[PDB]
């Protein structure tokens, strides 16, 4: 019985709390999306706009939690851009081996980072990110999938450093198990390719949903409350009316 524009009225404060805490670019994109919902003539329009803000906001809070830069989808590097810039000596072979799977070059993960060699972001340690993912999975039972490229049966070494990539997929959706299973299935082929190029990559995927206890998420609890008080209620009010 409530107009959608009126639904956005009741959740003014929840959504203002949300927009204030998200990263800037993330906050702006979410705000535009929110005015699209307020000015949504159809019920499919509103729901589809609400779904985008669920994904965009959560990713903003994933970046905040991990002190990574939030990247708008439009500015996200592809795999090929990462091979081109981080492993330029192997890019030509990366192209030849992707002839039969050209969509590999265009895979665009949520986070495409490299180890600080000192638009691919850099991080202090890939193994530290992998370990903290594995810890929470082991400690709280949170489903992850995790794949590391490895040429033949090579050992790690202590006398030389190599460049390396961390590829991370995240998300906020009900089927947590299905998300990580399909993510690591998408990226398996490129892990195998990376092994044949002698390129070290780790792929991580994880997922939260609204039933995950608030202390157990991949984002800070404070961020869990902001999502549940805003984007989650908006989904409940859209249905009821």
């Amino acid at each position: 019985k409530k107009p959608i524009a009126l639904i956005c009225a009741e959740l003014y404060k929840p959504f203002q709390d949300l927009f204030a805490a998200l990263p800037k670019d993330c906050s702006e994109e979410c705000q535009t999306l929110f005015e699209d919902i307020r000015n949504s003539e159809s019920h499919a329009s509103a729901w589809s706009s609400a779904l985008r803000i669920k994904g965009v906001a959560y990713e903003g809070f994933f970046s905040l939690t991990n002190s990574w830069r939030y990247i708008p989808e439009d500015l996200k590097p592809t795999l090929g851009m990462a091979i081109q810039t981080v492993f330029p000596d192997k890019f030509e072979k990366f192209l030849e081996r992707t002839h039969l799977h050209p969509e590999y070059r265009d895979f665009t993960p949520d986070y495409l980072m490299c180890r600080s060699r000192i638009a691919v972001q850099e991080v202090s340690s890939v193994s530290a990110v992998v370990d903290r993912f594995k810890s929470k999975s082991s400690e709280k039972g949170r489903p992850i999938r995790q794949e590391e490229s490895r040429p033949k049966t090579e050992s790690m070494q202590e006398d030389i450093e190599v460049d390396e990539l961390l590829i991370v997929e995240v998300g906020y959706q009900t089927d947590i198990e299905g998300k990580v299973i399909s993510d690591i299935e998408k990226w398996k082929g490129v892990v195998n390719l990376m092994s044949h190029l002698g390129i070290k990559v780790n792929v991580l995927t994880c997922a939260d949903n609204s039933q995950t206890p608030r202390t157990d998420w991949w984002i800070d609890e404070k961020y869990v409350r902001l999502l549940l008080n805003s984007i989650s209620y908006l989904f409940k009010e859209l249905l009821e009316n």
Partner: antibody
Amino acid sequence: EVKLEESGGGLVRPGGSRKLSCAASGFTFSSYGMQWVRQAPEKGLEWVAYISSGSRTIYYADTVKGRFTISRDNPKNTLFLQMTSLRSEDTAMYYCATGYGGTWFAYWGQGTLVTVSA
Amino acid sequence: QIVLSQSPLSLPVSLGDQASISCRSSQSLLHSNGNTYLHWYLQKPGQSPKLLIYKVSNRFSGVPDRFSGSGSGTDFTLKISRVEAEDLGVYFCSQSTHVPYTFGGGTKLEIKR
């Protein structure tokens, strides 16, 4: 001078268990991977296990997988090998070793004898 | 599962002559990082092994310079330019490019008399 000193060898019944230690001195132990190598009497060398400086990466020879555990205590400059379900074929001199900068065996201990027999 | 094949099994050599010991690998030991982790050790009777050569041709610090190593890919050679009495023992090659790290079977250097 770099030195590695194994202890803990001795006699074990088949199926029994034994923990070896290796004390390291003369270098910054906590920055380097450490290894166990063994040699059965009158035979050649046989690699056993590797553990990275931060214990993040561990490798095992297939003949000890699921029976041996390699670990370390960096504040104590000590490398460990926990042996279980021991068999007569594990009778060997056990050496701990390190590359002090790589995965080769640059420094070796004097070794400690484990005899598995009833 | 790299298999390292040493030849000869035993090498009698006169004092002052050269010795040459071969180590063949079942696959290439070139690591993707560009290094080749093939190394050479000597075990004197009743002592623990000693490193001689690491990564094909790097003589370990303090090892006498009569010892040298060469090779690439799957074919490697340890040479003793002028054999001395203290060189009696069993020479091993070993690789650490792939897990498991593996050893050759040993070459027994014998002093000719």
